[PDB]
């Protein structure tokens with residue numbers, strides 16, 4: 302029975318306000334520890350990614366759930382997906398509004414429908430058929446987020462390997478600032494925002510959405526690891542393709558079936574946190590990595 | 597320069613009856629003809645793939661545009677996507693209602709917006725903006741799918757290689773009969789419903805949209821070519837893999853950057869036709885082909 306691991310990332314974009322970093326740091330730790338706390342009790346790779354991502358949605362410092370950036374009409378529309386490595390089972394929602402937790406709805410899509418993908422009104426209905434609390438829009442909308450939209454008007458993920466050596470991903474996002482209404486990114490789209498397969502590993506992505514879809518970044522990262530490259534080599538290879546081919550930046554986290562993991566980005570920043578052997582690893586900027594004890 | 601080629605399909609389905617056999621032949625013949633004429637007139641692969649899919653969207657005999665399957669409510673909900681392998685520019689739309697040509701709306705998302713995928717409410721807002729008319733959903737409803745939905749309770753695509761060397765795909769569908777409101781299959785997801793790359797090939801797929809999405813079928817088929825599998829071996833393994841791993845069945849059409857092409861399927865039947873070197877190739881059944889001359 303293998304040594305478990307969760308990795309966590311928190312949108313990969315431009316440089317961040319130095320004070321806000323403490324708040325971002327503590328958010329990464331929290332998701333990781335929750336994710337790890339779920340593995341600790343021999344809990345599944347699927348159980349774990351979902352719990353980590355639930356925490357970040359609820360954390361307003363991150364652009365998924367509460368903290369979601371705004372669309373062109375000042376509102377919050379959100380995307381998500383989850384995948385089970387074992388039989389490649391999956392669930393996703395795109396363009397949902399006025400619920401708290403997108404990643405759980407995707408899991409509701411995954412295990413409680415014969416389908417994999419619901420969108421907009423059909424998913425607003427499905428959430429209501431599943432007893433999902435509608436929350437006020439003012440709660441999901443923060444102040445910093447109204448500010449970013451004005452200045453333009455002038456993503457989070459988790460991967461995990463459980464004790465049985467199954468793998469899973471979860472990705473969740475409010476989208477991209479000043480996006481059109483109905484705009485779908487790479488997040489809810491299997492093989493682009495994430496992919497998990499026990500025979501390879503699992504990956505969650507963040508970056509220029511369109512560019513992530515265009516190249517299918519998550520499956521591609523995996524294409525390589527099957528070919529024999531390292532996690533770090535494969536992450537290098539795919540992110541560079543996304544830059545060299547479609548002129549797009551982004552970030553990724555992967556853990557393979559051997560339990561080897563890395564977090565790599567061609568964006569300016571990508572806060573990340575991995576937990577493995579009771580030791581938490583954290584970072585926001587390239588080549589500055591801390592390690593602390595997990596209680 | 598490259599001799600151009602178009603391959604078309606609807607839909608990797610079950611047994612086809614004698615009366616349907618012939619209309620279906622005529623529809624395929626017409627769509628392959630529209631595409632090849634565009635390529636013979638100097639048009640791009642994208643023009644040619646958009647060309648042929650509109651022909652099957654317009655034709656009531658095919659599950660896409662008019663004649664699409666009806667959802668759970670007795671309403672037509674449509675997905676389509678288009679991709680050029682030159683720069684990986686793409687457009688896609690999900691759960692689109694009350695419109696003739698979802699693929700035409702998919703092209704405009706690629707061409708007129710900074711996005712590559714739109715859905716439902718947002719899909720329609722952008723539609724109305726671009727002047728796409730609104731037609732009563734009823735006018736897409738056929739007594740065939742009407743009957744089929746009452747009973748159930750109790751897909752189209754093309755690949756092209758052009759005289760400039762450009763490849764492309766387009767895919768549109770009404771989905772699976774009686775789908776949940778806002779279910780979204782493969783057909784608008786890049787990598788699943790199709791993929792185009794000027795440096796490898798182009799692929800358009802069909803059948804069970806849930807399975808196609810998990811194995812990332814279209815892009816799976818292209819990794820197999822990248823490893824120097826002929827277009828036939830590449831279809832057979834990637835279809836071979838969906839079958840065993842998720843127990844999915846469907847079919848595809850694929851074209852290499854050099855002009856090699858194939859239609860395989862694992863369902864019982866798949867309408868397909870192909871025009872290259874002045875001839876038409878057509879089928880429904882395994883090796884039922886008739887190769888004629890084309891004026």
Ligand SMILES: *C(=O)C[C@H](N)C(=O)O
Pocket residue numbers: 312313380456457474475476477486487488506507508509510511513
């Ligand atoms: C998150 O980083 C952005 C996401 N990839 C998207 O929705 O485009």
Ligand SMILES: *C(=O)C[C@H](N)C(=O)O
Pocket residue numbers: 607608751769770771772780781782783801802803804805806808
């Ligand atoms: C058409 O049968 C295939 C399509 N992939 C779907 O939505 O089921």
Ligand code: NA
Pocket residue numbers: 357358359360361362363364365366367368369
């Ligand atoms: Na959040």
Ligand code: NA
Pocket residue numbers: 652653654655656657658659660661662663664
């Ligand atoms: Na049709």
